[PDB]
Design a protein around this ligand. Structure first.
Ligand SMILES: O=C(NC1Cc2ccccc2C1)c1nccnc1NC(=O)N1CCC(NC(=O)[C@@H]2CCCN2)CC1
Ligand code: PRO
Length: 491
């Protein structure tokens, strides 16, 4: 029992998340705060979604590349609105060994200024457009807020795409094309539902025209979290970096640029969504070992021979599996050993050999059933798909039951204290965002996230807008509201 999870997911969600990521061999802690080690089980998930996202962006003619880790002061402060948001979190290298550098250099929090410093040399005519680039790297944002593995780290793996188009229509089209790819990223591989929306003016990317987002929600602690982002930068970065091109009428024009990113935070959202009191729970598309086979003891040689036959037919069908034949541990140990590591299927094998069958157990609901030997391949093929849809449909229902539509403010704190979001009519005035955050944080006297702010913030203006009444006013200012917006506590 001590080798398993000792904290229930409902009781202590913070301690539960720490035990799950450690005992499943996903995360190892480090002697630098905010930095964590991705063990092979965690990095394998990253390679899976990386192989999917690569194949999809090649269809859009996006090409991979790598740009330097460092940036000078001259290039970093080109755009005013972009550096003002990143300035206190930018890490600076100031010396080599014991000798100071002739000029200080900064570690990339994002590669806008690094990549766009050389775009004018690549973009000179309309023939050089569209320019589409992507990187798979890490960036460093040295914040002093409470770190959490995967989702809130000072260094994080991600991809960052950067495109440049001839007009606004072509760039905005790619923004929402990428945004839907992020939806397939979370749905088809992590089984996590998301909400597409537009960020408010006070929550959009520095130097961007608008920011499209994919929002997720953690229902155990009532915290939303941005799953991915896709910005339409317009001509803002093109003006400060002088990224011009001569059009087909011999007139100089600014390019319409986009930037979009999705990090390993996607892995943490998956853990908080499907993890249970038994440990990690993994969708099949991001799990290395699909099935685990545990013997139960007469004739020991007959059980070893029978268990290896299932591992043979499973590996023949391109389904990687593992047979835990460790004689130093009981089956009960092996049961909890792989349930903590998120193995989707366990096949248990003396009476089963006499019946020429085996006990196939699911990880999501622990539903066991007898399956004959010759009919175990097809039964395990479909159970993988059924486990993936069950994890997504259950997560979709918990997401739907998390949004509460409100028309005033006297019903907002009740929904927040119920671990819910709120869909309220809003005038979208940027001045009201700080007013709502300060007031909701003041009224938050009953939380127990001691490291997360009790304030609620504008999450996103959902693309799926419900009908708007003619005289519906703003829930905060009372002015004529414009659209519905999602508010709530976030990561
Ligand atoms: O951001 C991260 N770390 C920071 C450093 C640190 C250090 C300690 C504690 C917190 C943080 C925070 C991050 N970390 C691990 C994995 N992924 C990450 N990023 C993302 O998932 N990204 C997509 C959402 C983007 N959100 C915004 O730009 C905000 C939201 C609206 C207004 N602007 C950020 C990029
Ligand atoms: O950090 C961001 O939000 C944008 C998107 C990826 C590159 N820069």
């Amino acid at each position: 029992n001590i080798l398993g999870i000792t904290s229930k997911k409902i009781e202590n969600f913070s301690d539960w998340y720490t035990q799950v990521i450690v005992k499943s061999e996903l995360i190892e802690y480090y002697d630098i705060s905010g930095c964590y080690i991705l063990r092979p089980a965690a990095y394998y998930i990253w390679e899976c979604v990386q192989a999917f996202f690569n194949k999809e962006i090649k269809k859009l003619n996006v090409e991979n590349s790598y740009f330097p880790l460092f940036v000078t002061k001259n290039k970093l402060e080109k755009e005013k609105n972009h550096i003002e948001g990143f300035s206190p979190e930018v890490a600076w290298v100031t010396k080599y060994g014991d000798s100071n550098l002739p000029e200080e250099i900064a570690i990339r929090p994002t590669s806008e200024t690094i990549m766009y410093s050389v775009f004018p040399k690549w973009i000179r005519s309309y023939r050089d457009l569209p320019l589409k680039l992507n990187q798979w790297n890490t960036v460093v944002r040295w914040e002093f807020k409470q770190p959490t593995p995967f989702i809130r780290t000072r260094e994080f793996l991600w991809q960052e795409g950067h495109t440049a188009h001839k007009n606004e229509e072509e760039a905005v089209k790619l923004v929402f094309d990428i945004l839907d790819l992020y939806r397939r990223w979370y749905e088809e591989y992590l089984a996590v539902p998301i909400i597409k929306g537009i960020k408010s003016e006070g929550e959009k990317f520095g130097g961007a025209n608008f920011t499209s987002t994919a929002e997720a929600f953690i229902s155990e602690n009532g915290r939303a979290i941005q799953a991915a982002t896709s910005h339409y930068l317009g001509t803002n970065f093109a003006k400060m970096f002088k990224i011009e091109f001569e059009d087909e009428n011999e007139v100089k024009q600014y390019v319409h640029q986009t930037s979009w990113g999705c990090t390993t935070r996607s892995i943490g959202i998956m853990i908080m969504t499907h993890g249970d009191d038994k440990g990690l729970v993994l969708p099949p598309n991001v799990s290395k070992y699909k099935v685990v086979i545990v013997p139960i003891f007469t004739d020991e040689n007959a059980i070893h021979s029978y268990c290896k036959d299932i591992e043979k037919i499973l590996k023949n069908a391109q389904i990687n599996c593992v047979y835990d034949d460790r004689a130093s541990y009981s089956p009960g140990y092996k049961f909890n050993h792989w349930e903590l590591r998120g193995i989707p299927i366990r096949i248990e094998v003396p009476k089963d050999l006499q019946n020429n069958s085996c006990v196939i157990v699911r990880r999501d609901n622990n539903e066991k059933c007898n399956v004959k030997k010759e009919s175990v391949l097809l039964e395990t093929q479909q159970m993988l798909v059924d486990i993936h849809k069950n994890l997504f449909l259950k997560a979709k229902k918990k997401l739907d039951d998390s949004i509460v539509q409100v028309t005033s403010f006297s019903e907002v704190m009740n929904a927040l204290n119920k671990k819910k979001m709120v869909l309220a009519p809003w005038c979208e005035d940027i001045a009201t965002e700080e007013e709502i955050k300060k007031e909701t944080q003041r009224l938050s006297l009953n939380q127990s996230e001691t490291t997360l702010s009790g304030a609620m913030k504008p999450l996103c203006i959902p693309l799926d807008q419900p009908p708007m009444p003619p005289n519906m006013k703003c829930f905060w200012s009372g002015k004529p509201a414009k659209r519905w917006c999602l508010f709530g506590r976030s990561y």
